[PDB]
Amino acid sequence: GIIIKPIISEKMTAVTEKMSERYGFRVSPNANKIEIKKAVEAMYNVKVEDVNTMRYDGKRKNRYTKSGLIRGKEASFKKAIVTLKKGETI
Amino acid sequence: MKRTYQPSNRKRLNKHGFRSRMATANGRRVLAARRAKGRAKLTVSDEF
Amino acid sequence: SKICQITGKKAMVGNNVSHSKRRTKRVFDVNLFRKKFYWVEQDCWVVLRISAAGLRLINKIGLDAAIKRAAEKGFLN
Amino acid sequence: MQVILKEDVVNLGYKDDIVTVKDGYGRNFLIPQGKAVIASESAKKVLAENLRQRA
RNA sequence: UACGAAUUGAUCCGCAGAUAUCCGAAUGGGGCAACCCGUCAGGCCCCUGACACAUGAAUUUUCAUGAGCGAACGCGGGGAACUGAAACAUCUCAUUACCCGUAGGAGAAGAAAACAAGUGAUUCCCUCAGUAGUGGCGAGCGAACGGGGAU
RNA sequence: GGACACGAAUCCUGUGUGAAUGGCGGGGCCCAUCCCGUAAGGCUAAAUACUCCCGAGAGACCGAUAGUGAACCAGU
RNA sequence: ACCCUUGGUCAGGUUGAAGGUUAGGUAACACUAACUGGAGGACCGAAUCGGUAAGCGUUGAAAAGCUUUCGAAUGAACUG
RNA sequence: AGGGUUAGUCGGGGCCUAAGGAUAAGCCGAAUGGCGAUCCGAUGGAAGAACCGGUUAAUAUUCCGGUACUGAUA
RNA sequence: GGCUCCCAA
RNA sequence: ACUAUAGCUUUACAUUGUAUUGGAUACUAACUCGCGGGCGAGGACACUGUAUGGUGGGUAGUUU
Ligand SMILES: [K+]
Ligand SMILES: [K+]
Ligand SMILES: [K+]
Ligand SMILES: [K+]
Ligand SMILES: [Mg+2]
Ligand SMILES: [Mg+2]
Ligand SMILES: [Mg+2]
Ligand SMILES: [Mg+2]
Ligand SMILES: [Mg+2]
Ligand SMILES: [Mg+2]
Ligand SMILES: [Mg+2]
Ligand SMILES: [Mg+2]
Ligand SMILES: [Mg+2]
Ligand SMILES: [Mg+2]
Ligand SMILES: [Mg+2]
Ligand SMILES: [Mg+2]
Ligand code: NA
């Protein structure tokens, strides 16, 4: 299960209202395009055309305790914009 | 005025990195001493 | 690791002592050299790094017996 | 150096006998060149036995 | 805070198991630690998951063993100087500090070619004793025999 | 040359030599008598040293500028 | 600081060496004339490297600077 | 606090070697170790291969539409 | 860029 | 200046042997070097270890 969660955002909504065969997933950072493609085919029973990926490092954050301050980090992830064949949706 | 510290990541890792420390016996001595003191950072390879 | 292969002799640590009894560290070195020997039993030639005392032992009891004794004593390797 | 003589040797006779020589003359010349062999106790016993079998 | 599990016995405690990513002696080859690149046998299907693929020593290519780390204590190889002697060189500090190698639950030592002027293997404690000695006979250093014990 | 309390009898050895088979060694230089022992092969428990760790306890020891650098976010 | 390997940079103007050609001159060289040519730890001067003199600053904008002036600027140059 | 970085063709790496570094066979050396020609090592060599137009609050030779090219594989 | 010239090659 | 000492250097022993009229000559087999993948040139010298005598502000510890 390399797919973590779908991307619900204004940019994804705009690109899906434009193209309607495009869907954005957030996946594990070490999964390459071929396995992302096979995984979405397994999880949704669709034929996939092309995959675009970009790596995000975690945001640095400031955890606040009673006394002072601690420096922490969010987890890294990989974005996967997925183009289905013309005719199918998710 | 040029100051003493002129950063270069390749030079930093070549001079003080984990593999360069592990290469010699005295570098392993330094690593053992830092582990015995209990340092959270062991080499310059730890920082990011 | 320059050690006589027959006797096991190695360099000793001692003192240079002057007339005013000043003492300075020094090394007594082994009279060591490489020599080629004819091994009769195997009919071969063997190069040994030996001392003059080892050469004396070889000339006393034969090269084959000296080699066997050194091997049993662990000097030869 | 105590040597059993194996072949004939000029200026030092006594073939098949016991002789004393300088260590270099015999470690560097005779034993390398086949004639003569160091007179260990075993070789002395064998030489004495060969002499008694000849006689 | 929610949402659930739990008398059909959760949670919790004791013992035994399963799984256990990557780096690191790191050992398939490299490398800027946590990464890059491979070969051979299979299985899937350009890409994947699961095998194997280091080196040295006993050993006869089957086999066990080793490497690295880590408190103090043990043994061994090298080995200072400041200081004291109211300077300083013999001497002292000291066979110390430190560096290096290597064990075990302890290690080392141990059964007289011994001490002595009768005792009877090692080890440790109390005495002998700051004595005998030693020493620019200065500063200093400093036993053993015998006796009493632990074993 | 070194270690032995010892700054040259005992023990060790870099260099060069080198026996004996009752003999040999020791008793503080060297000789003789006397006494003691039997080198150049090996193994061996106990009584002795120490605490990273585990368990059970204690103190005419400290009480937050004290006591560990660190009672807390500490080798931060 | 020095060295090793591998890269990069240097507006514009001036001067006019070796050499070449064509004339005269020689027995032949020599030797004069014009044009050409474009050398140099050469000249003037930006970038750049350096730091002469003065002024300012001296709990400074700065633990060594700023302004004006000044040296070098195809080299024993500067620089990654 | 939420969102944002999209590549067969851009850059890098995968390939190659320099200085230098680590090593093999060997050499040296109380120990720890020091040397020593294949490997590593860019600041150099080789790199196969386009574009005009649109388009976000924030990306674009990477997304969209047209025109292409280049390497493997059946 | 060929090309010319030069030596420090 | 005093005392040492790295280095250099002399001889003896070891490495290290054989013959001839001893200390010279000669020999080759220790030992060293070159070429090719044995041959040539040397040679008991040279080199190195132990001991010994010189030299030693190159270096060190000190005194004045
Ligand atoms: K695409
Ligand atoms: K990408
Ligand atoms: K023992
Ligand atoms: K600059
Ligand atoms: Mg912030
Ligand atoms: Mg490896
Ligand atoms: Mg004093
Ligand atoms: Mg405190
Ligand atoms: Mg100029
Ligand atoms: Mg300027
Ligand atoms: Mg100028
Ligand atoms: Mg390569
Ligand atoms: Mg490059
Ligand atoms: Mg922008
Ligand atoms: Mg001086
Ligand atoms: Mg002093
Ligand atoms: Na590996």
TrEMBL record, chain A:
Tell me the domain of life: Bacteria
> Would I find NADP among this entry's keywords?
no
The record's InterPro entries line, in alphabetical order, gives: Nucleotide-bd_a/b_plait_sf, Ribosomal_uL23-like, Ribosomal_uL23/eL15/eS24_sf, Ribosomal_uL23_CS
Q: Where is the secretion signal located?
A: none
Which GO molecular-function terms appear in the entry?
A: rRNA binding; structural constituent of ribosome
Quote the cellular component terms of the Gene Ontology held in the record.
ribonucleoprotein complex; ribosome
* GO BP: any one term: translation
Q: Which UniProt keywords apply?
A: Ribonucleoprotein, Ribosomal protein, RNA-binding, rRNA-binding
Residue spans crossing the bilayer: none
The question of whether Kinase is a record keyword is answered with no
- Please give the PANTHER family that the UniProt record associates with this protein: LARGE RIBOSOMAL SUBUNIT PROTEIN UL23M (PTHR12059:SF5), RIBOSOMAL PROTEIN L23-RELATED (PTHR12059)
Q: What family is this protein classified in?
A: Belongs to the universal ribosomal protein uL23 family.
Subunit relationships: Part of the 50S ribosomal subunit. Contacts protein L29, and trigger factor when it is bound to the ribosome.
The entry's function note states: One of the early assembly proteins it binds 23S rRNA. One of the proteins that surrounds the polypeptide exit tunnel on the outside of the ribosome. Forms the main docking site for trigger factor binding to the ribosome.
Protein name per its UniProtKB record: Large ribosomal subunit protein uL23
